[PDB]
Amino acid sequence: RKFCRFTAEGVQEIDYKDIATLKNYITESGKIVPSRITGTRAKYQRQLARAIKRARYLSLLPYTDRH
Partner 1 sequence: PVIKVRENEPFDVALRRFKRSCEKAGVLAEVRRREFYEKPTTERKRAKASAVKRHAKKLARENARRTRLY
Partner 2 sequence: MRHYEIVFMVHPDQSEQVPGMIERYTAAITGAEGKIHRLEDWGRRQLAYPINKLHKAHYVLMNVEAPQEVIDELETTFRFNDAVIRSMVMRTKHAVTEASPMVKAK
Partner RNA sequence: CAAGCUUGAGUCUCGUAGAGGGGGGUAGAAUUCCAGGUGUAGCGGUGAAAUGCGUAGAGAUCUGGAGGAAUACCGGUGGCGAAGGCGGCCCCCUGGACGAAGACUGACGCUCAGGUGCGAAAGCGUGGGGAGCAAACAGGAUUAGAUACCCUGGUAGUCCACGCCGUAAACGAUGUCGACUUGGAGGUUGUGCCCUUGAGGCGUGGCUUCCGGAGCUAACGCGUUAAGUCGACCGCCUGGGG
Interacting residues toward partner 2 by CB under 8 A:
12-13, 15, 17-20, 56-63, 67
Q: How far is the CB of 57 from RNA (least distance, A)?
A: 5
Task: Return d(Cα 56, Cα 30) in angstroms, integer.
Answer: 10
Q: Select from RNA, partner 1, partner 2, none the partner in contact with residue 36, using the beta carbon and a kind-dependent cut-off of 5 to 8 Å.
A: RNA
Residues that bind RNA (CB under 7 A): 3, 8, 30-36, 41-43, 45-50, 52-54, 56-57, 63-64, 67
